[PDB]
Amino acid sequence: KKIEVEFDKGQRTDKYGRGLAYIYADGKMVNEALVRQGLAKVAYVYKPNNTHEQHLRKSEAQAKKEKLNIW
């Protein structure tokens, strides 16, 4: 039983053309690694960095810049 919605009677829209492709489902469809091209970027979630020692690896406190000399 058709819904009709409200009126339904009155399209006359048609839209004619032909400029696409077609083959058949028997080919390649199933079985592919669905992880194509590693791409992602969001806002900073903020993880723990600099314990206190200032010298983790070389400089955890970014001792290379101003290092926040307090000025």
Place this chain on the structure above:
Amino acid sequence: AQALWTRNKSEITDEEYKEFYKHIAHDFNDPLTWSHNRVEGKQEYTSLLYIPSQAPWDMWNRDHKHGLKLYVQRVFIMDDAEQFMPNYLRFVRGLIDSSDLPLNVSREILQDSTVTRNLRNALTKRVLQMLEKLAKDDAEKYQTFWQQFGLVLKEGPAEDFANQEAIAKLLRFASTHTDSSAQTVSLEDYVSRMKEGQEKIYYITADSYAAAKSSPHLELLRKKGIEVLLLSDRIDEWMMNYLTEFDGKPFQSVSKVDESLEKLA
């Protein structure tokens, strides 16, 4: 008192099209829309195809319901002639009057004939462009249509391989945008909705909407402000194994992890 299809597109009014659909479908259903085709030159044929408002019960039955009414020389031959319709366009009911074919034509002719093989391949474009036509004509009619025949249309990219992009626009799904099981958001909407770093199309391949939307993989991205499309199909993974990329934007099943979920987390 005249054969409706044999008249011009202008000589048939809107009411008569929708009334005529009730004859060919053996129903009382009004079509959401249609396209009247009449072709001239070498091979003259009138094709008249409609888009139903709802799916008949016997649409997914062990018996066939896909196909058109074959007319030749404006004389009825047989109906449910499915050799004119693809699998992803099996929902179409309509008719086709062929002036070229023999009057003594039968079902096996339509299958093996090269002309009739071209007929199907021609009608494939007119229906598909009539689907996007309906999608732009009336989104609410197309929403009803996709709830009734959407499963069928998802078989699209598999058949018309090179034309995957056209069906990718027609594809409507749910997402973390709206909790509706209503298949609303398309890849058209998604590309428009995409923000900084969300260049990778996030989907979930899952057997049920309940287990899909109950998955923690969604909240992993949802809290970061990423949008994941909810697929609850039985054909989900099959279709999505060809949907590896669209517009240059590659797909990601959140059910799987790569460097994207490393950098995002």
